[PDB]
């Protein structure tokens, strides 16, 4: 809304907060990102370290679908299990089955302590996650 701006407050001040000495001119320091190495070097170096240069190998025709690979941790597994099935689950009995690729995950990582044992179908798994789930009483079965 125009009625909340500083122009309304500045009607009658003759300078609009830009000073009598310096004044408000067109482009006092160049346009855009000009002078990044010459007269804006301190700003670029202290706030954006690493702006200039090259690094690494090139990948000409990048396709992200073959690289798709989301992850989920061991202590977050209760997000994919219904409440009643989670309640009726204990070591040695029947366990719920979780399908990761139908929920949008590819790899199972092993952070934290698992809350409810289950059988997990995943494309990838880590060493620690596999060991911890087997010790806790669940299982991991590979899928594609």
């Amino acid at each position: 809304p125009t009625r909340f701006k500083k122009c309304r407050h500045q009607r009658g001040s003759t300078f609009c907060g830009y000073g009598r000495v310096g004044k408000h001119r067109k482009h006092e320091s160049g346009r855009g990102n000009a002078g990044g190495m010459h007269h804006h070097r301190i700003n670029f170096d202290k706030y954006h370290p690493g702006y200039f240069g090259k690094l690494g190998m090139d990948h000409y025709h990048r396709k992200k679908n073959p690289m798709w690979k989301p992850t989920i941790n061991l202590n977050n597994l209760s997000r994919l299990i219904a409440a009643e099935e989670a309640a009726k689950a204990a070591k040695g009995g029947t366990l719920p089955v979780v399908d990761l690729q139908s929920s949008g995950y590819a790899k199972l990582l092993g952070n934290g302590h698992i809350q409810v044992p289950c059988i997990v179908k995943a494309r990838y798994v880590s060493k620690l996650a596999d060991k911890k789930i087997r010790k806790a009483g669940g299982a991991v079965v590979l899928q594609a």
């Binding site: 679908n65 073959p66 029947t94 089955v97 590979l142």
Partner: protein, 208 residues
Amino acid sequence: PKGNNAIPHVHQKKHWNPCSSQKGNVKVFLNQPAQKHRRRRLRLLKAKKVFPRPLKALRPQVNCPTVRHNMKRRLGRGFSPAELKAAGLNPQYAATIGIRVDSRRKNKSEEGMNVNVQRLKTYMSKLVLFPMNHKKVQKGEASEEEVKAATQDRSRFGDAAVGAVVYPSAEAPRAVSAEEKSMCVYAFLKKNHSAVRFFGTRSSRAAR
């Protein structure tokens, strides 16, 4: 001063703004509700014109490509000649009773072919065909009562007679097996990955 801000890349250095000397290059959406109304009206009029035929023709079920959409299903362009032959239909005849035909799809496995043949069989079972001459009815054509008792399918994707796409069912809860409790799966997966990853170097080292 400038301070700590993001380095901007706003990409507006061409003559896009219409002014006293430039025509500009812009696109606005101020006609969106009017066009929505027009499209719905046209669909209703077309359905009335082609009554009692279904508004949308029958289409098959296909699997999405790539490893990201491997688990999804959707509708394809048309049925393959192999599927049509398995169902017992000439493609040219099938093109005249509201079935789409696509001669490019390959049918590289039996499961999708079976599901499409099932769709075709259901459609043919539910089809009602009007005679060319009601005074002289022939085989495979409906009677006067069946012709009189007819309705139109106005579903968005058609498929009012075959249902939506079918997804595989979920697995029921079970118990862990002794093999699953004993075996380590990371070692299995890693060995299989390395077998392909180091194939060339292993073969070259063997050839020495």
